[PDB]
mmCIF file of C-alpha atoms and ligand atoms in Angstrom:
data_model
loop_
_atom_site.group_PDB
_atom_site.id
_atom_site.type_symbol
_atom_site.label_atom_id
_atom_site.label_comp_id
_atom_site.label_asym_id
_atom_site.label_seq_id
_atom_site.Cartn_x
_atom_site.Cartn_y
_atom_site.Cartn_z
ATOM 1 C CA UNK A 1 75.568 157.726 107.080
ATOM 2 C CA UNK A 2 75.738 161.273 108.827
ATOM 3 C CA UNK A 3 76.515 161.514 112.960
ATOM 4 C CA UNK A 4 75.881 164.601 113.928
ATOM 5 C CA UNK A 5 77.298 165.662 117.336
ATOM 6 C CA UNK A 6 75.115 165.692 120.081
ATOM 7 C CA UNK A 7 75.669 167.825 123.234
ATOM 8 C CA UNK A 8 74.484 165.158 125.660
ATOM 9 C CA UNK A 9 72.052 167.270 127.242
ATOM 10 C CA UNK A 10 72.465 170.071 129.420
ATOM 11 C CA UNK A 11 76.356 169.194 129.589
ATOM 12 C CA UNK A 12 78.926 172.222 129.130
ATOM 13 C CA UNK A 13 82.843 172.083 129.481
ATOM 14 C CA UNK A 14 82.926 172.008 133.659
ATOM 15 C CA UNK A 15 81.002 168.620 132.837
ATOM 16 C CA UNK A 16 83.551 167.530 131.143
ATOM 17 C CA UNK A 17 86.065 169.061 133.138
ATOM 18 C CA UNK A 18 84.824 166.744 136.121
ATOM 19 C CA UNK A 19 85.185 163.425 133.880
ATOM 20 C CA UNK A 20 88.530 164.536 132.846
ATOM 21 C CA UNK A 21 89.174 165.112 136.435
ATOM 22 C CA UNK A 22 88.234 161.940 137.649
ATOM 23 C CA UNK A 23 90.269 159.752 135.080
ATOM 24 C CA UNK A 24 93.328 161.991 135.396
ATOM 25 C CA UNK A 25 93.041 161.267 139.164
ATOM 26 C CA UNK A 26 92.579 157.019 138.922
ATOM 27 C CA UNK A 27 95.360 157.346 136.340
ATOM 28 C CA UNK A 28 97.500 158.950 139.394
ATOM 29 C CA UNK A 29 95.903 156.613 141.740
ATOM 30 C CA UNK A 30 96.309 153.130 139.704
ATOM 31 C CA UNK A 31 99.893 153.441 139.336
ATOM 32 C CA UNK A 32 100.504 149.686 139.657
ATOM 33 C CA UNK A 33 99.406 148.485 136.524
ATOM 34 C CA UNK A 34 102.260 147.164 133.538
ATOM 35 C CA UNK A 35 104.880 147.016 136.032
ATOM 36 C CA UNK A 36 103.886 150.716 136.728
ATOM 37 C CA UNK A 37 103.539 152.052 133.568
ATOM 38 C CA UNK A 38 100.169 152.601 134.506
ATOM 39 C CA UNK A 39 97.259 153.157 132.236
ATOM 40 C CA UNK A 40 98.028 156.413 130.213
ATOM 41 C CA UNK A 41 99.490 154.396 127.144
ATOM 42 C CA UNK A 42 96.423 151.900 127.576
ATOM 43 C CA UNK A 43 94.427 155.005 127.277
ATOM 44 C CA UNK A 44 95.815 156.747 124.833
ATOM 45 C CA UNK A 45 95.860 153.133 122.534
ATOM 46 C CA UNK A 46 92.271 152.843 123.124
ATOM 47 C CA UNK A 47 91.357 155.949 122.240
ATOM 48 C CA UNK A 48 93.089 155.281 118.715
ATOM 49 C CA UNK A 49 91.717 151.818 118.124
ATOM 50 C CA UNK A 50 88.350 152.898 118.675
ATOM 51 C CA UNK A 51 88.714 155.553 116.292
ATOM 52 C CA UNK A 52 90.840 154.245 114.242
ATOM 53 C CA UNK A 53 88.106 151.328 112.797
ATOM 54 C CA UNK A 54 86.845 154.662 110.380
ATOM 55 C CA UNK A 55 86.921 154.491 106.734
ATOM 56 C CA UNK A 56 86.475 157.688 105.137
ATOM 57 C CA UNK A 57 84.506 155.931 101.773
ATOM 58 C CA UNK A 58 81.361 155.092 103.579
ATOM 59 C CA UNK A 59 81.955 156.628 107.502
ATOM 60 C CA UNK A 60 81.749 153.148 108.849
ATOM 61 C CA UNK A 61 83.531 152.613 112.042
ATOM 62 C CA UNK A 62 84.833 155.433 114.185
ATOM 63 C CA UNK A 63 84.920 157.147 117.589
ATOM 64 C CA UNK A 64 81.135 158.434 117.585
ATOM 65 C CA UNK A 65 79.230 155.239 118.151
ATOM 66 C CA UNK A 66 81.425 154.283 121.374
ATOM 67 C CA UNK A 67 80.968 150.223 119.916
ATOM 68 C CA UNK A 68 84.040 148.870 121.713
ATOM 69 C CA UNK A 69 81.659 148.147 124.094
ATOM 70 C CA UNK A 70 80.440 145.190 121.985
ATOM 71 C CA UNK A 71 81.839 142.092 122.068
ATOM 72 C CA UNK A 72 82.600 142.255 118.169
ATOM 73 C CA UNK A 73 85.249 145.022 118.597
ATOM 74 C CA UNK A 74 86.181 144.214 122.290
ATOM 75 C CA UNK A 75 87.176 140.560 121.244
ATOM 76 C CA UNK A 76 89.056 141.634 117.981
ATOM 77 C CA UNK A 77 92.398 140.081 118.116
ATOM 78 C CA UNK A 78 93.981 143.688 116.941
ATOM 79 C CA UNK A 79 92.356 145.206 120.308
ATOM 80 C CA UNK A 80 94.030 142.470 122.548
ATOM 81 C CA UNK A 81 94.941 144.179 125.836
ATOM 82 C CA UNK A 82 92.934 147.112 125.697
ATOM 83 C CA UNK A 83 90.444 145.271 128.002
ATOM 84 C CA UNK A 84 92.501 146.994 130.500
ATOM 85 C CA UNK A 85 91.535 150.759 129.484
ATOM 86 C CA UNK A 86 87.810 149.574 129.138
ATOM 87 C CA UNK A 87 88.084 148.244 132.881
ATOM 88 C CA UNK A 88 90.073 151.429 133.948
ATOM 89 C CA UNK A 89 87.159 153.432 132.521
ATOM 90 C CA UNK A 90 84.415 151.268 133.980
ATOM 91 C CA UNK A 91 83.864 153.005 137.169
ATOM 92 C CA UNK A 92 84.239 156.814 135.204
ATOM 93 C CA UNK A 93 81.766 155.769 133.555
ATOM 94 C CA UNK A 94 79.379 154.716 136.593
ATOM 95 C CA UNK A 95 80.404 157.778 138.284
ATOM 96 C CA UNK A 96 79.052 160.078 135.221
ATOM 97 C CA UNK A 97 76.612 157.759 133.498
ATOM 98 C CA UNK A 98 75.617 160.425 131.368
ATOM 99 C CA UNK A 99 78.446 160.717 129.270
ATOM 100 C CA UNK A 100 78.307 159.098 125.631
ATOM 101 C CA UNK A 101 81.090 155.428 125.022
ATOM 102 C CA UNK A 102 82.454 157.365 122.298
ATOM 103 C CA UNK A 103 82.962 160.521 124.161
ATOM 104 C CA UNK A 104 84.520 158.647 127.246
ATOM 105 C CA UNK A 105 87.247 156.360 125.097
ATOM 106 C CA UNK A 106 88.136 159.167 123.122
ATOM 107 C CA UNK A 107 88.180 161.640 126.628
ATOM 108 C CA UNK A 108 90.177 159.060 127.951
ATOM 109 C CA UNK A 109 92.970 159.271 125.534
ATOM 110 C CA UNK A 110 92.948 162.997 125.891
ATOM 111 C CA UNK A 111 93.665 162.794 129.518
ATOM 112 C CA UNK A 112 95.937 160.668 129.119
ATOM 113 C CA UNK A 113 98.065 162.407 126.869
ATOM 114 C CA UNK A 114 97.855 165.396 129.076
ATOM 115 C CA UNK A 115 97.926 164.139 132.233
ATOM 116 C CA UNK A 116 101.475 162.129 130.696
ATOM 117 C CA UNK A 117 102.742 166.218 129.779
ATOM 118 C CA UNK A 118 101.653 165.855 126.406
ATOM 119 C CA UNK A 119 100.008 168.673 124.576
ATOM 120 C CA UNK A 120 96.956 169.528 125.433
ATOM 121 C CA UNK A 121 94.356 168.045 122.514
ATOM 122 C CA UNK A 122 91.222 169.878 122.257
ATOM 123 C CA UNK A 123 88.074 167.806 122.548
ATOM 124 C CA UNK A 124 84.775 167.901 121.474
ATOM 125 C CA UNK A 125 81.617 165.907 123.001
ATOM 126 C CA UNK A 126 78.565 164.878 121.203
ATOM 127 C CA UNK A 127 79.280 160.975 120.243
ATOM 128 C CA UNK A 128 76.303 159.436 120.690
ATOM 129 C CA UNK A 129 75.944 155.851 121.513
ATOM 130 C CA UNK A 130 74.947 153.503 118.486
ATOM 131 C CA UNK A 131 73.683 149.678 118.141
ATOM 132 C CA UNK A 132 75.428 146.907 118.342
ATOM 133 C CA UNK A 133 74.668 146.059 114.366
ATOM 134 C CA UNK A 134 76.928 149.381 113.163
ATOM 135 C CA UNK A 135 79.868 147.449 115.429
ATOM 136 C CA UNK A 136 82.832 147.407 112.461
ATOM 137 C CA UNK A 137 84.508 143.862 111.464
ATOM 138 C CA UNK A 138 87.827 143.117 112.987
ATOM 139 C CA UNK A 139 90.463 143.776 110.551
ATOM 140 C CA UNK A 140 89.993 147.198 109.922
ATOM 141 C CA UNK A 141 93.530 147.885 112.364
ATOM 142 C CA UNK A 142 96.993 147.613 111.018
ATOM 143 C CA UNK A 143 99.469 145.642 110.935
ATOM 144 C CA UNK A 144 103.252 145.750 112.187
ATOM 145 C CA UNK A 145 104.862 143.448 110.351
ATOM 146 C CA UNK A 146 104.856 145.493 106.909
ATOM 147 C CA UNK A 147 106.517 148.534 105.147
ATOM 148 C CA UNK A 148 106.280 152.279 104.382
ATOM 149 C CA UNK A 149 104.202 151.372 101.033
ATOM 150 C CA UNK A 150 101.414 149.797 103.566
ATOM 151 C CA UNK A 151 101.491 152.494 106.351
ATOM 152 C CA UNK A 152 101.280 155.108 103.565
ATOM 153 C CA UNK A 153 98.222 153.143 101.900
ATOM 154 C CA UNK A 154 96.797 152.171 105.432
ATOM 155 C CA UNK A 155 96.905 155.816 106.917
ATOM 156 C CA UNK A 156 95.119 156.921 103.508
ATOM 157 C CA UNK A 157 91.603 154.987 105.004
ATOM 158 C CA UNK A 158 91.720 157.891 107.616
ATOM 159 C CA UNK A 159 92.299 160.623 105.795
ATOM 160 C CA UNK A 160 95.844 161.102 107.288
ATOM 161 C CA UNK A 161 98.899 162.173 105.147
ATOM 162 C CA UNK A 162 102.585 161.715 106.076
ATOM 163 C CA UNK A 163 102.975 164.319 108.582
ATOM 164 C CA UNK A 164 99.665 163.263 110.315
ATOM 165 C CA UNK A 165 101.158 159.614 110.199
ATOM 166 C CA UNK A 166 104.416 160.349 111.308
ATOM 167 C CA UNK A 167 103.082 162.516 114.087
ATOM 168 C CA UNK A 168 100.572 160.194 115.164
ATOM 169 C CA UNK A 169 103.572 157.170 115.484
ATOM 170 C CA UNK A 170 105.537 159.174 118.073
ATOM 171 C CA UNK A 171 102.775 157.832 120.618
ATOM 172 C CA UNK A 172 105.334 154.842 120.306
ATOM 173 C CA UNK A 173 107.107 156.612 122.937
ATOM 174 C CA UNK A 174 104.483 155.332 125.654
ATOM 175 C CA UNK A 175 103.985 151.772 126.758
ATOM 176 C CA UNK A 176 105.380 148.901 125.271
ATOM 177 C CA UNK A 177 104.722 145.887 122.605
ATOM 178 C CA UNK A 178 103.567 142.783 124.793
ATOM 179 C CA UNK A 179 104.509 139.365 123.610
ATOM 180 C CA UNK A 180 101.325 137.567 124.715
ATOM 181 C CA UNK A 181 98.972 140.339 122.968
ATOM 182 C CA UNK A 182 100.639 141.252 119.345
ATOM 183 C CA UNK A 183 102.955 138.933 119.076
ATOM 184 C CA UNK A 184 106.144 141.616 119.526
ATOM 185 C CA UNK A 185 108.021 142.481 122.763
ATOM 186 C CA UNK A 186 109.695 145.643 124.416
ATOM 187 C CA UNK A 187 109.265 149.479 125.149
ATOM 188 C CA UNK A 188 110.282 152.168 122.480
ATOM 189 C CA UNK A 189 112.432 154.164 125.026
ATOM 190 C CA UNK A 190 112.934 155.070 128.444
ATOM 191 C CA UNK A 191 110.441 157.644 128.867
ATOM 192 C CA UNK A 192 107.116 155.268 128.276
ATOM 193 C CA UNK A 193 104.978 157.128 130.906
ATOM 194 C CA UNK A 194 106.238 160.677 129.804
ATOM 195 C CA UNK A 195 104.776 162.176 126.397
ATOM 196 C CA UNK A 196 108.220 163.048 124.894
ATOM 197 C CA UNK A 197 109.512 163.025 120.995
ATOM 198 C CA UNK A 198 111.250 159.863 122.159
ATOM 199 C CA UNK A 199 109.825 157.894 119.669
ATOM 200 C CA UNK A 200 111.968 159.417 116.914
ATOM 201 C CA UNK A 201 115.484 160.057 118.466
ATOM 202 C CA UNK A 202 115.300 156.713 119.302
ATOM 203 C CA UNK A 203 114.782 155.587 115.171
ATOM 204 C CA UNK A 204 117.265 158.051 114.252
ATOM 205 C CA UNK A 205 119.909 157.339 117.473
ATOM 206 C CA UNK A 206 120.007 153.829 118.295
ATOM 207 C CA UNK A 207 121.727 151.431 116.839
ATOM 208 C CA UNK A 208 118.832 149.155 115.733
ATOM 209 C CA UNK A 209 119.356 144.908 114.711
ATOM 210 C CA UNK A 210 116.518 142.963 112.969
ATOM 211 C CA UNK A 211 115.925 140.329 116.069
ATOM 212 C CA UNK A 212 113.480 137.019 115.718
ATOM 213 C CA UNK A 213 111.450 137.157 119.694
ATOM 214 C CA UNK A 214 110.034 134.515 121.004
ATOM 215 C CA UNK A 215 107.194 134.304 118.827
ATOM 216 C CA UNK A 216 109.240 134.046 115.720
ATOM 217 C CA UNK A 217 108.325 137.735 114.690
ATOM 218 C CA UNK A 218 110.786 140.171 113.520
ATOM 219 C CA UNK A 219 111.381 143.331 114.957
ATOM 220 C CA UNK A 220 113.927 146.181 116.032
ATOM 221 C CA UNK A 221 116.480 145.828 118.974
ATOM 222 C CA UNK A 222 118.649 148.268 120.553
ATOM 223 C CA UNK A 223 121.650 147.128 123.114
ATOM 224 C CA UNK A 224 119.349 149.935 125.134
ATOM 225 C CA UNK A 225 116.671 147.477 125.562
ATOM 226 C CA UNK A 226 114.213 149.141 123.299
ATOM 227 C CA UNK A 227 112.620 148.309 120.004
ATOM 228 C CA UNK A 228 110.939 149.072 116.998
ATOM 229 C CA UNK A 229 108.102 147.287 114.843
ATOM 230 C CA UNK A 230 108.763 146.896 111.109
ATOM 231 C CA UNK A 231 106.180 149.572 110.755
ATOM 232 C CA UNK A 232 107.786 151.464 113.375
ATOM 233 C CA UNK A 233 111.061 151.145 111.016
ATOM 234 C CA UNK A 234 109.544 151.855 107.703
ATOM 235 C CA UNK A 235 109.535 155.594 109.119
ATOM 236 C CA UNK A 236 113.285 155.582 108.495
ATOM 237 C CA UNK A 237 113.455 153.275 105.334
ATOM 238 C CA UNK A 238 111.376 155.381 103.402
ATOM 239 C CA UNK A 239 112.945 158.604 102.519
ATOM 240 C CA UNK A 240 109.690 160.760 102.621
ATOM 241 C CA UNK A 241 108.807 159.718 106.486
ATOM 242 C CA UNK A 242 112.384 160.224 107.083
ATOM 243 C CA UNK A 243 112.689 163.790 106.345
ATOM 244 C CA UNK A 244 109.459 164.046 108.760
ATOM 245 C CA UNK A 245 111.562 162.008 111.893
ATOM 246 C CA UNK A 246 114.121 164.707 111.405
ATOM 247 C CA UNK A 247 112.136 167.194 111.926
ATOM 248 C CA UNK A 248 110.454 166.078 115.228
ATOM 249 C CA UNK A 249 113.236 164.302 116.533
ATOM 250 C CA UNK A 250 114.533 168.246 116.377
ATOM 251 C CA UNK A 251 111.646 169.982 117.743
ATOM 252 C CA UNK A 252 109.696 168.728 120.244
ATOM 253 C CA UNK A 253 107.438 171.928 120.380
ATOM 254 C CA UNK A 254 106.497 171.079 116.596
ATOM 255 C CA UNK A 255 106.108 167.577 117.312
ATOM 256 C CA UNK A 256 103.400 168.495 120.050
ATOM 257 C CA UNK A 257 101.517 170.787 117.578
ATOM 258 C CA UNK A 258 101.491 168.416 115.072
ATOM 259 C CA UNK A 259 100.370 165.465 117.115
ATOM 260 C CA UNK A 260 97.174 167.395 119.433
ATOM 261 C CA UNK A 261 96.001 168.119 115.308
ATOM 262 C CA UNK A 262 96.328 164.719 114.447
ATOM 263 C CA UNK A 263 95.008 163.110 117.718
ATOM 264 C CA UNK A 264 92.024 165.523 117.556
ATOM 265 C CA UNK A 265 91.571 164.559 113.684
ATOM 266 C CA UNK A 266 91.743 160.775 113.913
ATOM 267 C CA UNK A 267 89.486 161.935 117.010
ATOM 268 C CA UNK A 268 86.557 162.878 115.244
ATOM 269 C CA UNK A 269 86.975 161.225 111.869
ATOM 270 C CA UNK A 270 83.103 160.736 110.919
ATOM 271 C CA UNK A 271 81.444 162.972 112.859
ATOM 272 C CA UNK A 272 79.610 166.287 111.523
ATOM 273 C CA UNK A 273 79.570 169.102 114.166
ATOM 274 C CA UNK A 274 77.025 171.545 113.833
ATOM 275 C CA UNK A 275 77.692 174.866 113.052
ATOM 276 C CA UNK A 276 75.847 176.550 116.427
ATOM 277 C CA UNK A 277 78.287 173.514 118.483
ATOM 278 C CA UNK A 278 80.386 174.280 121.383
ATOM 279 C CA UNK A 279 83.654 175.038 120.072
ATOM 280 C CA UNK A 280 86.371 172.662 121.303
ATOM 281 C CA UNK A 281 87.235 171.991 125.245
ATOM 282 C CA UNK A 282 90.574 172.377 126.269
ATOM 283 C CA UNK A 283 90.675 170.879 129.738
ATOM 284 C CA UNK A 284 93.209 171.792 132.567
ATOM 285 C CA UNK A 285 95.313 168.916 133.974
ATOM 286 C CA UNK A 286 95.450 168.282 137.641
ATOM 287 C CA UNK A 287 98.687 169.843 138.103
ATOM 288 C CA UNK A 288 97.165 173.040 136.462
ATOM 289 C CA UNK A 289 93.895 173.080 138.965
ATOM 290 C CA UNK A 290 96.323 172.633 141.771
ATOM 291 C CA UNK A 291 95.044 168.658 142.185
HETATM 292 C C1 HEM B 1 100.993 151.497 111.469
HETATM 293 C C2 HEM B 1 100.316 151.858 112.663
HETATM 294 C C3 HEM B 1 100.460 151.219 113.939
HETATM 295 C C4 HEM B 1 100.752 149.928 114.221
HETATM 296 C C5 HEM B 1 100.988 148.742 113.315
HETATM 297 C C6 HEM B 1 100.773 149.787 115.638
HETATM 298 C C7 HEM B 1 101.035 148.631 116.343
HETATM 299 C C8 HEM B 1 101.181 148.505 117.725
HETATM 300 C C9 HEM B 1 101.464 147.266 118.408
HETATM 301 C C10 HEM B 1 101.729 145.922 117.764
HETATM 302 C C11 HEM B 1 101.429 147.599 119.739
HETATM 303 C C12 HEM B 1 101.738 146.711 120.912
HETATM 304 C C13 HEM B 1 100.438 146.152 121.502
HETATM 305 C C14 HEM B 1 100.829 145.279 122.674
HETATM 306 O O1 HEM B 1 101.526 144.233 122.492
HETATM 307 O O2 HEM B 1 100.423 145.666 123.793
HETATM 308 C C15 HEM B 1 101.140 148.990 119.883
HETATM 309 C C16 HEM B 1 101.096 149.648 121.088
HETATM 310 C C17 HEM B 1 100.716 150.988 121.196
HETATM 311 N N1 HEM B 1 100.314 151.798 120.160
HETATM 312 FE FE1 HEM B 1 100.337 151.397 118.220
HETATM 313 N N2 HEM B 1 100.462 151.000 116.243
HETATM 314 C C18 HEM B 1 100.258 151.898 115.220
HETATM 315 C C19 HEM B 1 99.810 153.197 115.356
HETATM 316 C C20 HEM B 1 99.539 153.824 116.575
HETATM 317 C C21 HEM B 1 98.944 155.136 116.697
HETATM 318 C C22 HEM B 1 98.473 155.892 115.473
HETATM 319 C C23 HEM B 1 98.813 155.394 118.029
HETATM 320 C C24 HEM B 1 98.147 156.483 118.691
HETATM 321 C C25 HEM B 1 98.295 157.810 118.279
HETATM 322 C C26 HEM B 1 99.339 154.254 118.721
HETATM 323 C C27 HEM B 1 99.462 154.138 120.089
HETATM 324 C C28 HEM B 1 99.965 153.004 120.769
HETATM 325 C C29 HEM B 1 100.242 152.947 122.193
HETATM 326 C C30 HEM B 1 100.059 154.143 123.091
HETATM 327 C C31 HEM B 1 100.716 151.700 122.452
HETATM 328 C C32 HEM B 1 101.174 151.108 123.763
HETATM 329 C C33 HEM B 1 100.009 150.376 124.436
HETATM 330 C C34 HEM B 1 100.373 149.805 125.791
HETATM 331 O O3 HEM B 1 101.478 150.020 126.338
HETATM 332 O O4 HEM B 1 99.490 149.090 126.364
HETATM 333 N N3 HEM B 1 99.762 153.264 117.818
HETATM 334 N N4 HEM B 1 100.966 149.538 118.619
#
């Protein structure tokens, strides 16, 4: 199956520009939530989950039919917690009714990365909204508990090659593993509201020990407090991902180059854009507007 983009109608960037707005501001305002972590990592992870159902064979799954919003995908064990972003969202998405699911969760993520100083990640609109029969089957999200050999493989389902996978795991910086919701505990670093390289001085700096928590999963502990998943760790074991750590734990400017591409990729995995399309928004944060 083809999705082709579809301007919902009328809309142009200041549209969009007002939706961005309006999340950037509740993510500001709702500064509470995960012990005030607040929503940006929620964001950001929903955003990926609910594009990261595609599989390039057959263009199943993906951001454009926004079908989190059944109870399929919203119940799927891998998507545990992300209830939160959806409810965060909710009253966006009252507010500007017009704009597609897929366009909102994927805006969302966007904002958040931004609003977190992040790069900025262009964005396109145009996911339109589809039934609750092309909702993908649970299991199409990976798993922690494995090695390179299954991120590698995994990653290859999206079209993403080392770089893009490496790059797209230093959004491990933000947020935290909770216990009651995968099964692993902790936060990658100290910066988990802050869009840094984090991620990978913390692989390459601490001084990691292969813990049992309190579910009787294995993961990564640092004296620091932080942690690593197995497939967090499989970035250092394997000598190919390694080289790639290096690199951003080195340069955070490439790091941010490489990730908006990535982000915007796994973005719009699936979805054809017309040739006569607006090209891609970049939107201002809040701080740039002066709100
Ligand atoms: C091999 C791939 C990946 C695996 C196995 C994985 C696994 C996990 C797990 C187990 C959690 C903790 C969930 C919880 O307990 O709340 C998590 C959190 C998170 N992941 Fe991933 N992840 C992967 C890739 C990614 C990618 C590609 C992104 C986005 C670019 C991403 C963004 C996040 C964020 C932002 C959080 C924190 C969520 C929060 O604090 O609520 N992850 N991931």
């Amino acid at each position: 199956l083809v999705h082709v983009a579809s301007v919902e109608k009328g809309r142009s960037y200041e549209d969009f520009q007002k939706v961005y707005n309006a999340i950037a501001l509740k993510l500001r305002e709702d500064d509470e939530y995960d012990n005030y972590i607040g929503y940006g990592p929620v964001l950001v992870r929903l955003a990926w989950h609910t594009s990261g159902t595609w599989d390039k064979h057959d263009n199943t799954g993906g951001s454009y039919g926004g079908t989190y919003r059944f109870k399929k995908e919203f119940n799927d064990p891998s998507n545990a917690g992300l209830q939160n972003g959806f409810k965060f969202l909710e009253p966006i998405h009252k507010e500007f009714p017009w704009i597609s699911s897929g366009d909102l969760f994927s805006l969302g993520g966007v904002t958040a990365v931004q609003e977190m100083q992040g790069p900025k990640i262009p964005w396109r609109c145009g996911r339109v909204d589809t039934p609750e029969d092309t909702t993908p089957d649970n299991g199409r999200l990976p798993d922690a508990d494995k090695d390179a050999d299954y991120v590698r493989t995994f990653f290859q389902r999206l079209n993403m090659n080392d770089r893009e996978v490496v790059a797209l795991m230093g959004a491990h910086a933000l947020g935290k593993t909770h216990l009651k919701r995968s099964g692993y505990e902790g936060p990658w670093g100290a910066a988990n509201n802050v869009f840094t390289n984090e991620f990978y001085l913390n692989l390459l700096n601490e001084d990691w020990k292969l813990e049992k928590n309190d579910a009787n999963n294995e993961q990564w502990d640092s004296k620091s407090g932080y942690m690593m998943l197995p497939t967090d760790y499989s970035l250092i074991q394997d000598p190919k991902y390694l080289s790639i750590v290096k690199e951003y734990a080195n340069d955070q400017d490439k790091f941010f180059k490489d990730f908006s591409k990535a982000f915007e990729k796994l973005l719009e995995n699936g979805i054809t854009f017309p040739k006569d399309a607006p090209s891609p928004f970049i939107f201002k944060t809040l701080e740039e507007q002066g709100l």
